[PDB]
Design a protein around this ligand. Structure first.
Ligand SMILES: [Ca+2]
Ligand SMILES: [Ca+2]
Length: 174
């Protein structure tokens, strides 16, 4: 029923001498056929907003400076074509993953979801909890039901596969 969704990621940044923590938010499209019509159809910094997906990214931060939802993504499900039938949101660590710095390395990052339609916080996962589990993580999922949108959390964690978690949605694993 959510007519408008707005995700918000936020975390405390720590500048020691130039280095800092910078998470990246993303969204992968997924068809109801069990495979996305093309994972490459995911919104990122290379796309200010979807032309027909009605999706729009607020902006990818570079440190987390902001006493509020650092990064965020606006999705007007009330304008999602009939092509896609399932969408998912994800938050992966930037290059800090190579230097071994999962979100846990941060002081305590947090995710937030709200329906820009009703303006009521829906939920928020704590990275400090699913952080010591890996480096990347999925907040939840979105799908259609009886002609009505419905969000569903799952809590998953990839051992680092920003390039894999993308196409991996196009093919199921063993
Ligand atoms: Ca970022
Ligand atoms: Ca922040």
């Amino acid at each position: 029923s959510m007519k408008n969704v707005l995700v918000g990621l936020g975390w405390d940044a720590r500048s020691t001498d130039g280095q800092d923590f910078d998470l990246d938010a993303s969204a992968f499209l997924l068809a109801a056929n069990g495979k996305v019509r093309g994972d490459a159809d995911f919104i990122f910094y290379n796309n200010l907003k979807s032309a027909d997906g009605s999706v729009t990214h607020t902006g990818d931060n570079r440190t987390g400076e902001g006493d509020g939802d650092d990064e965020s993504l606006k999705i007007k499900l009330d304008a999602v074509p009939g092509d896609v039938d399932k969408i998912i949101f994800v938050v992966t660590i930037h290059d800090a993953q190579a230097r071994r710095q999962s979100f846990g390395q941060v002081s305590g990052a947090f995710i937030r979801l709200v329906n820009d339609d009703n303006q009521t916080e829906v939920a928020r996962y704590d990275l400090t909890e699913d952080a010591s589990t890996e480096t990347a993580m999925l907040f939840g999922e979105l799908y259609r039901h009886n002609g009505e949108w419905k969000f569903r959390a799952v809590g998953q964690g990839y051992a680092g596969g920003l390039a894999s978690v993308c196409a991996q949605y196009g093919i199921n694993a063993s």
